[PDB]
C-alpha cells in the first residue's frame, strides 16, 4: 500500500481508475517532506490525511499512537469506525491499493 514516488493528485487518479470505494494508499507528504499521507477513496471521491511521525510513534495528529506506519495502517483497516472527521462523517480504510 506504500507508493513512494507519487503526488497527491497522482494518488487521486490512481485510486479513481484502479481502486474502488474504500481503497487507500500511503505516500510521502508534499507539505511535510519526510512525512507520509494517506489517500482514501470514498463515495467516488478521494480525501487525504496527514500522518505524524514524532520519532517516538506515528499517529494522525491525535488518536491512538503506533510504533510503525504499518501498524497504524493495519489498525484503521481493522477499525473502520475510528476515523471520524469533524463533520461526523466516517472515512474508512478498507482495501490497500498495491503499487
Amino acid at each position: 500500500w506504500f507508493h513512494p514516488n507519487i503526488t497527491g493528485v497522482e494518488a487521486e487518479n490512481l485510486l479513481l481508475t484502479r481502486g474502488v470505494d474504500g481503497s487507500f494508499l500511503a505516500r510521502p507528504s508534499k507539505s511535510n517532506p519526510g512525512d507520509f499521507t494517506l489517500s482514501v477513496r470514498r463515495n467516488g471521491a478521494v480525501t487525504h490525511i496527514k500522518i505524524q511521525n514524532t520519532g517516538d510513534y506515528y499517529d494522525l495528529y491525535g488518536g491512538e499512537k503506533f510504533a510503525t506506519l504499518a501498524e497504524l495502517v493495519q489498525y484503521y483497516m481493522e477499525h473502520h469506525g475510528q476515523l471520524k472527521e469533524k463533520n461526523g462523517d466516517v472515512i474508512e480504510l478498507k482495501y490497500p491499493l498495491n503499487c
Partner: peptide, 9 residues
C-alpha cells in the same frame, strides 16, 4: 494542492 480532512479523534 489537494484537500486534507480535519479529524475529530
Amino acid at each position: 494542492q489537494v484537500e486534507y480532512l480535519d479529524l475529530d479523534l
